[PDB]
């Protein structure tokens, strides 16, 4: 009856990590920005299996930064980096307020943001919240970076496909498009070097 730990949260941890990397997350550079040395902070796929306060500071500041760098500097001016008990409480309060706004704006597709989740950042509920936060940041990037004619791509990705066959086809197309651009990049660099 008796209440079997839903296998559902393991792959979300992995794809979250891929998303951070894809956004340009560098463990050494971002840790240094938070005044912490790499010897004491564990980054990776399992970084929030146990409550990890240090990683929480770094990753969230990074994602907010990637979302709105100007707003990020303004909202955290007086509490970044969280060095004392007073600053820490302010940083958490700020993260919760900002994410609550995002959660209100996006509606039923974004997890409910409760203040208790930030007291001990760790666990499946926390990872689930961070993944959807990372996903949101990527979609904003696709919307910004997508040319006036491809803005529809961000809308299409937001529209949840419930049919597995349709999702597969869409993925195949995306994979191909990536391989093409990767090949083009090689060609342009080669040709430029030769001509020069």
């Amino acid at each position: 009856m008796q209440s079997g730990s839903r296998p559902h949260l393991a792959w979300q941890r992995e794809h979250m990590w891929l998303a951070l990397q894809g956004l340009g997350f560098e463990s050494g550079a971002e840790a240094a920005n938070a005044g912490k040395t790499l010897v004491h902070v564990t980054f990776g796929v399992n970084m929030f299996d146990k409550p990890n306060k240090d990683a929480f500071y770094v990753v969230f500041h990074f994602l907010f930064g990637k979302l709105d760098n100007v707003r990020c500097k303004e909202v955290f001016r007086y509490c970044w980096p969280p060095l004392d008990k007073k600053r820490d409480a302010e940083f958490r309060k700020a993260c919760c307020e900002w994410l609550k706004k995002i959660s209100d704006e996006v509606g039923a597709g974004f997890p409910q943001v409760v203040a208790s989740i930030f007291l001990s950042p760790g666990g499946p509920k926390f990872v689930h919240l961070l993944y959807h936060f990372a996903r949101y940041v990527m979609l904003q990037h696709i919307k910004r970076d997508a040319d006036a004619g491809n803005v529809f791509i961000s809308e299409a990705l937001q529209s949840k496909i419930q049919d597995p066959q349709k999702a597969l086809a869409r993925n195949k197309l995306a994979r191909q498009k990536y391989l093409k651009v990767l090949q083009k990049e090689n060609l342009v660099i080669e040709e430029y070097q030769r001509k020069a």
Partner: protein
């Protein structure tokens, strides 16, 4: 005036379509690149049959949905195709002109090209296997794709060169050319104006 490049791309697409034994091309042998272009990129009932075919190949359940619609309802067919294509991230849901064939030739070629990419998607390794059973459940194919994709992504992100591909930099020029390359906005205008065709 459909430039020489669009006609060549249309021909390529036409060849790919032939290779995929598209039933709509049965008894139609076009050797003239312009005829091939008019077939693929101008509004016609045939073009719509081809697109319908391409879409039925990518997503088979759509075929039952389209076949139930009477010939007098052509506008509704076009809207259903646009909706699928939107779900595949290829065009906007109101881009009806692209489906009708009124969009720019390049846009049309690129569009049909992408559809074909999906159909000709090298099905990896295992598939020597021939005839057998139709019946295989949609569920086994999805599991395989996920697995493969996971391996690709893992490899892509484990690589030290991955970050460099996201922001490619290349400077092949020696130091002695730097002054030429940093030179005043006026030299740049002279160099770009000299390339205009009448010369």
């Amino acid at each position: 005036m459909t430039g020489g490049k669009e006609l060549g791309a249309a021909v390529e697409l036409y060849e790919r379509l032939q290779m995929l034994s598209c039933p709509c091309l049965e008894g139609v042998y076009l050797t003239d690149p312009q005829s091939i272009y008019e077939l693929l990129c101008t509004p016609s009932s045939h073009r719509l049959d081809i697109l319908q075919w391409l879409c039925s190949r990518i997503y088979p359940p759509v075929q039952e949905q389209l076949s139930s619609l009477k010939e007098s309802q052509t506008d509704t067919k076009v809207k259903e195709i646009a909706k699928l294509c939107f779900d595949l991230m290829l065009c906007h849901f109101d881009d009806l002109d692209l489906i009708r064939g009124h969009a720019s030739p390049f846009k049309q070629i690129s569009f049909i090209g992408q559809l074909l990419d999906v159909i000709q998607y090298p099905d990896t390794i295992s598939s020597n296997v021939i005839l057998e059973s139709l019946s295989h459940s949609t569920e086994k194919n999805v599991v395989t794709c996920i697995r493969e994709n996971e391996e690709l992504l893992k490899e892509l992100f484990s690589s030290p060169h991955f970050q460099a591909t996201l922001s490619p930099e290349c400077n092949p020029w020696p130091a002695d050319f730097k002054p030429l390359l940093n030179a005043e906005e006026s030299l740049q205008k002279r160099a770009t104006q000299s390339s205009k065709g009448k010369d």
